[PDB]
Amino acid sequence: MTVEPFRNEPIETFQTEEARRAMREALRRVREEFGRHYPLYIGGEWVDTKERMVSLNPSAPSEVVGTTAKAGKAEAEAALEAAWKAFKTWKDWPQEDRSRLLLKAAALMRRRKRELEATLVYEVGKNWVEASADVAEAIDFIEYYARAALRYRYPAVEVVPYPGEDNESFYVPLGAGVVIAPWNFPVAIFTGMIVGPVAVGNTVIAKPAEDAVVVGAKVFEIFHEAGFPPGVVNFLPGVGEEVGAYLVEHPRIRFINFTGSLEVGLKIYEAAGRLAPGQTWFKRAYVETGGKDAIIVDETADFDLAAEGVVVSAYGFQGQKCSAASRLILTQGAYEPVLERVLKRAERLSVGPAEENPDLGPVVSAEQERKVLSYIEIGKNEGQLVLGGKRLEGEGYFIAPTVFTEVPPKARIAQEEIFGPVLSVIRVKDFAEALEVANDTPYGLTGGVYSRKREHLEWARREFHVGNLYFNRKITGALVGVQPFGGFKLSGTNAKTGALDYLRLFLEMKAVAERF
Amino acid sequence: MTVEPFRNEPIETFQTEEARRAMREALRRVREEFGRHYPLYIGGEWVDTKERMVSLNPSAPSEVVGTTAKAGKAEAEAALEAAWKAFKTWKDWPQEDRSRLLLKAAALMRRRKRELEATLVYEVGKNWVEASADVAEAIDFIEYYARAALRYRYPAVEVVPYPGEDNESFYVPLGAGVVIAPWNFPVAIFTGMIVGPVAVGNTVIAKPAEDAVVVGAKVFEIFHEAGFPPGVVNFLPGVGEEVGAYLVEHPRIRFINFTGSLEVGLKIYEAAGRLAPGQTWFKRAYVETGGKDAIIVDETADFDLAAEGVVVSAYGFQGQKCSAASRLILTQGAYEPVLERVLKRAERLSVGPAEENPDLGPVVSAEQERKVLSYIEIGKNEGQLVLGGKRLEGEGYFIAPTVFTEVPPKARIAQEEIFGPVLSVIRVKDFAEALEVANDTPYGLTGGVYSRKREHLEWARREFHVGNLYFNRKITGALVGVQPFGGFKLSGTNAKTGALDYLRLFLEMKAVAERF
Ligand code: NA
Numbered sequence A, B: 001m002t003v004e005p006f007r008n009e010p011i012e013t014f015q016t017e018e019a020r021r022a023m024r025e026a027l028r029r030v031r032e033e034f035g036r037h038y039p040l041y042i043g044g045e046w047v048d049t050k051e052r053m054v055s056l057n058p059s060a061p062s063e064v065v066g067t068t069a070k071a072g073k074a075e076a077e078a079a080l081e082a083a084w085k086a087f088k089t090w091k092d093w094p095q096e097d098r099s100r101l102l103l104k105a106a107a108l109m110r111r112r113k114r115e116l117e118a119t120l121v122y123e124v125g126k127n128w129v130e131a132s133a134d135v136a137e138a139i140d141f142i143e144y145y146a147r148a149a150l151r152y153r154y155p156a157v158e159v160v161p162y163p164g165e166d167n168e169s170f171y172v173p174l175g176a177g178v179v180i181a182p183w184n185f186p187v188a189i190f191t192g193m194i195v196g197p198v199a200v201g202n203t204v205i206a207k208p209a210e211d212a213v214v215v216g217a218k219v220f221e222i223f224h225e226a227g228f229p230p231g232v233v234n235f236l237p238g239v240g241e242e243v244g245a246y247l248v249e250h251p252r253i254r255f256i257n258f259t260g261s262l263e264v265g266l267k268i269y270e271a272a273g274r275l276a277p278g279q280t281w282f283k284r285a286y287v288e289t290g291g292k293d294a295i296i297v298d299e300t301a302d303f304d305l306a307a308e309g310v311v312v313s314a315y316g317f318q319g320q321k322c323s324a325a326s327r328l329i330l331t332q333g334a335y336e337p338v339l340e341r342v343l344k345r346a347e348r349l350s351v352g353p354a355e356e357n358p359d360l361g362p363v364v365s366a367e368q369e370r371k372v373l374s375y376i377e378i379g380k381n382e383g384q385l386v387l388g389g390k391r392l393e394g395e396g397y398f399i400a401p402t403v404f405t406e407v408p409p410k411a412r413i414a415q416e417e418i419f420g421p422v423l424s425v426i427r428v429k430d431f432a433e434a435l436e437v438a439n440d441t442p443y444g445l446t447g448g449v450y451s452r453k454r455e456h457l458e459w460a461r462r463e464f465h466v467g468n469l470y471f472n473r474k475i476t477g478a479l480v481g482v483q484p485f486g487g488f489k490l491s492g493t494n495a496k497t498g499a500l501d502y503l504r505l506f507l508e509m510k511a512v513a514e515r516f
């Protein structure tokens, strides 16, 4: 099969009247549908339940954006049966056929981009460009994995020949697994985590984050329309740990693909290591578990450029990114000039209902707000609050862009993932100390350096121990294909998304010799 | 760096007078050297201990092949410190330099081939050709991984370009890890499990199997002579669980490479899933955990060819292989002709001291002998004993080639890995039933089919669910490069040895972007 070379889906900036008009139209359609109910999707059909889940607007939490069905263990077992039944034949599809199915799904998603963006705006409080980046990335994952999967097609393995024999090695999919998706990229990462394993012959049971069940269902409408055979992909929104735990611990779950908090990732990995009664394999678990990401700026940097990149990195989607700059490490000569610019830029950021395209919408839920406010309280004892640090007026979960300075490297706010608009500024003597401070956390996801000194940049290339490192630019928004995404240390298992290597994680190899 | 394309090291058959003469002299010199003491190897030096371990000749257990130092927790910690210290600079060696070091080690091993084979004969009771295949495979691992490592060299990752930026993805080694090696291939697999990680910049603490500590020490002599920097490879023979448990559970062990029993493998995988106090990463654990491997024969096969291949697969190295044919599955039309041929061939097999180059030497230890004899007692009550089934006379651990027939597919002797010269013959209606029975174990390592029917071979290609499948030939002796080796299900994690993919397991990826 021959398609155009992969390119990334353009991220809409809404600079044209037509773009703005199209968004307003999408926002109107989506809100007119706030009354909709979305069932489970199991074995190729929408399956409702007696109990339901409610999805709220974080910019107006008294407003319901939709309701969904609620899976328990029984529906989890039904989905598992459907997934294994589907696997028996889905595994035998030619790779070209599976890749075409994905390409169809990408084309349908592209055609519904505005509707999906507008759903992210209302359901998770993304502003317009954050919303567009999320959906574009989801399209990218489907387009990239469709093509990348062909690189593994029968028989892909390079082997040494032997006289009088055919020696053939080839990959085969694992089976049925469970995807446990995050709320902060509930189209992009939700889609990527499902379609990567599915592209090469696996089948998947997907549990959306509670906060983003509506947009998850809409992605499944796309899967349904694309025509994935029954049981290949399944959708199980649920409350609390019931569904996820049942599947993670199940003897017949073959793999687990997880993105979310370290607390939960650690439990998943530990459970994956155990042989459940009657289990007949070693479970694979892929976890991406967040970061405490730093930007270093030294005295040679373009300070204006640095301040812009820090502000985008720290406060983009309200700092609710595993990639967010939550630490700003400044050498002596960079401290005053950089901090002053960061403060001036940050104090101008607007915060309000996401649909108005503010610089920041609200945090995602009452629980997120509680967590972020609690860390702000901790931060008041550990550093010097110099900007924000409070809830803003309205029922929406609006929190001001927050900055603490003179933060000790080993402070709780300098070590623990806050996942909100809170930046900790750390002052260091020189570049060597900046690297030491950058490295001394349990995590290793993203990092950045602003500097004009080549020796400092190339030193960081070698020694700033993070999976995704960026020089003289923002540290968020890794692009599929361009920047393989995934970390070191307690940021997870280094499963690089948007990379050729990702699909190998969902395959095993068979070696077959015939002696003639 | 440019070297000749990889070829496998030829396996000596000892058919020429020159080869016999060389081998007799090598065996004489090794025997003359019985009783020699080998210390631990830690941070570039041989380090002795007060306690010692004894290695016996399984063909004449009153004979002490040698003794070694015995490591406990303190020596394990000293080795870990040395391995992390070495890692700091070893990771920074150009890949060409590391690869050249492996090539030197291969050249030195090649020059000591006869001595190592003779050490295997005396220490683990391999006959001459089994010893030669073992050493040749060790040489192959070093040659193969030296070349394969270069395919991963800076910056190896294929990424999509982006305007105005350099995007550079590359691999880095993980750190210091522990190797727990088996007694049955204590040159080949001991070597491969160590030099693979080490090739790409990792460092290793290696624990030899208790029964094979002398040959492990000799491999370390080669490593020391080759000039691996201090700390890069470390040798810790020990008794029982102490050293292995201490390292597997350690917060500062980065990875674990294991080959041995399912029982032990399951505990290792479970422990690697836990975060030890102060641990700052998700451990990787690679395990290869044995098999219950079948050869299917149908009525279309060459029955004499099948019987030869079955006897070799079942009884080579006394059936003490993860790859050994421990099940013979015969369709109704093949049952009588193949079984009669197998019986006639097996009853002619010689058994005696390994130095005599018999068809079968002894099993490896008194405990192994006990276990195998216990399973023979179990088998007598499950199927029909038709050959052997007893210990022979002599102090060496000699067990007769054993055959049970009309074995129920779910019998313990048809399910559990006996690891001795015991073949279980299962009679089935047809090929479909043969595949069902072949698949219905918890394992998935090796298997074979003797058939002339193309439809049956190609059906097995798709449905006989084992990592290493062979048609119309023996199912043991997978060659490095030619047949990537590793299984499915409870045969382990499908870490394919002697394959390009093996080295990827010991690397993580970094993505570094510079916006100009
Ligand atoms: Na919501």
Ligand code: NA
Pocket: B055, B056, B057, B058, B065, B123, B124, B211, B212
């Ligand atoms: Na021994």
